[PDB]
């Protein structure tokens, strides 16, 4: 809806609404870019009128965020998909698409045929997945040199509680192995909340 409007229902009729949608969608996608990560600045976001939510989690916000656009629908949708999917990438999935929805459709009409355009993302969305799954190069709790202790330490070392990675490096090693709950379908994984974790000031 831009320019003199003879039509309703998000008709800027084409590239206008396309742009207006990439205006729409990205205008949602920006909350995350700053909210990305915990160091990502939280946003105090009114839920109704006096009900404020403070969230740097995007798809959590995108559930607060309400859908006034087809752009607004799907990003809330797809991020809330990724949200209920995991919770890791709720923020993340929101950022790049605003550019990715700023890009391919421009080629999609530059189609010899419209299909080959997004596949430039797709086999690349593969080519990365290949390269991604190829990565053990960082993020290893699969093995450390002392195995999980150092990895749990490197975890605790990447954090600060204060002095850490010492009994806590060890403590992570316990927690999973402390859990004999065998996750279904032969999963060698132990729910970390199934641990009895007790606390002393």
């Amino acid at each position: 809806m831009e320019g003199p409007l003879s039509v309703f229902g998000d008709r800027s009729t084409g590239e206008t609404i396309r742009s207006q949608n990439v205006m729409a969608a990205a205008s949602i996608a920006n909350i995350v870019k700053s909210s990305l990560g915990p160091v990502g600045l939280d946003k105090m976001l009114v839920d109704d009128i006096g009900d404020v939510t403070i969230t740097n989690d995007g798809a959590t916000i995108l559930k607060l965020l309400e859908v006034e656009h087809p752009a607004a629908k799907v990003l809330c949708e797809l991020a809330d998909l990724q949200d209920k999917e995991v919770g890791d990438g709720t923020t993340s999935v929101v950022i790049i698409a605003a550019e990715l929805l700023k890009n391919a459709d421009e080629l999609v009409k530059q189609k010899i045929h419209p299909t080959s355009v997004i596949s430039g993302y797709r086999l690349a969305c593969k080519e990365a997945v290949r390269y991604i799954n190829e990565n053990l190069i960082v993020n290893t709790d699969e093995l450390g040199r002392d195995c999980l202790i150092n990895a749990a330490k490197t975890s605790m070392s990447s954090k600060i509680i204060g002095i850490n990675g010492d009994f806590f490096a060890n403590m992570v090693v316990d927690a999973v192995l402390a859990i004999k709950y065998t996750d279904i379908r032969g999963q060698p994984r132990y729910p970390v909340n199934s641990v009895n974790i007790l606390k002393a000031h």
């Binding site: 729409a24 949602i28 920006n30 946003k43 404020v52 859908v67």
Partner: protein, 129 residues
């Protein structure tokens, strides 16, 4: 719906409320004590050394003014007093650094400073306590 906001515009409105919150009570606070008057829409005077009164009684400025009466009641519960202190201290601490540091532009190195002064508080307090 679909919405986004920016930075100092949202940051200054904090001070804009936070300052005014911090203002008259610092003349009211301490042995020097003043009346913070409210003109009711009804036309009546409400004269306080307490900010929360005039705050609660009137239009709520959303970002800062909604925040402090809470931390006031947070503080009002803690030792029983010092709502006036918290609301003036924060807006005070929120003012000169921010734009200065936000023209230097950074949230975080400001954040660590809140603790160190709060820590430089603790020790010399309990030293000179």
């Amino acid at each position: 719906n679909t919405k986004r906001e920016s930075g100092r515009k949202v940051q200054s409105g904090n001070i804009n409320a936070a300052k005014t919150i911090a203002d008259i009570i610092r003349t009211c606070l301490g042995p020097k004590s003043m009346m913070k008057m409210l003109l009711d829409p009804m036309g009546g005077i409400v004269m306080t050394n307490d900010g929360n009164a005039i705050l609660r009684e009137i239009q709520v400025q959303h970002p800062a003014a909604k925040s402090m009466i809470e931390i006031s009641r947070t503080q009002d519960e803690e030792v029983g007093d010092g709502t006036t202190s918290v609301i003036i201290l924060a807006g005070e601490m929120l003012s000169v650094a921010e734009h200065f540091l936000e023209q230097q532009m950074h949230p975080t190195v400001v954040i660590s400073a809140y603790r160190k002064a709060l820590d430089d508080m603790i020790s010399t307090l309990k030293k000179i306590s």
